[PDB]
């Protein structure tokens, strides 16, 4: 559930 | 950036736009005539970044630049461990004449605090699901190690620090990484990561903390 705030964002399973 | 509003023109000299093909996707901060700070996980091969920015779809304002960057490091620990130390510095290929609308800012010299005062700013998603054409700015604080070291377990680590988190849902978010967290007058933080989604109540947004990376970023710079 946790993303890193770029555009597209890189997002993990947290 | 959710919650906030158009910043005032050019009151953000510092602010840099990292785009590819003319689409954003993040921002840094200009720290020196000819290095930008950003996330390390907007690292590319080659940037071209706009300076003395307002809107992005906008003729030239007057002022400002588009310039090439074609060298950028990450910082030797970045993800290590996972979401870590997550800057690194751009190389203008150029160095930029500062001016009225184009500016560098320097790194807090203390490290962040709760209660600190903050500005974040940005192009990235809005609350209502859009992306800006202006920058955007909005008012976060800073809360205690502690807090951020509970919401952000099991990942919390000293390179990072929470600002938000308030009952406003005032926060970065998607497009806005890499980005300045601007408090007392001096650049604290870059955007980082946060919780998905962005702007919930009790979830501040994590920021790379800067104060513990100006020896490395000035050995860098003076490299
Ligand atoms: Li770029």
New binding site residues.
Partial sequence: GFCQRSIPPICFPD | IINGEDCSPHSQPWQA????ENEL??SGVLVHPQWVLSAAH?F?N????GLGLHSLEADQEPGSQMVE?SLSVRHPEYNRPLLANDLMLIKLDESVSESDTIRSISIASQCPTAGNSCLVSGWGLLANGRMPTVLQCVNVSVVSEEVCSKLYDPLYHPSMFCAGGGQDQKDSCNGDSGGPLICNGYLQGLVSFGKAPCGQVGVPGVYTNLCKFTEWIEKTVQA
């Fill in positions: 736009a990292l785009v590819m996707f993040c907007c590319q080659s940037y071209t970044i960057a």
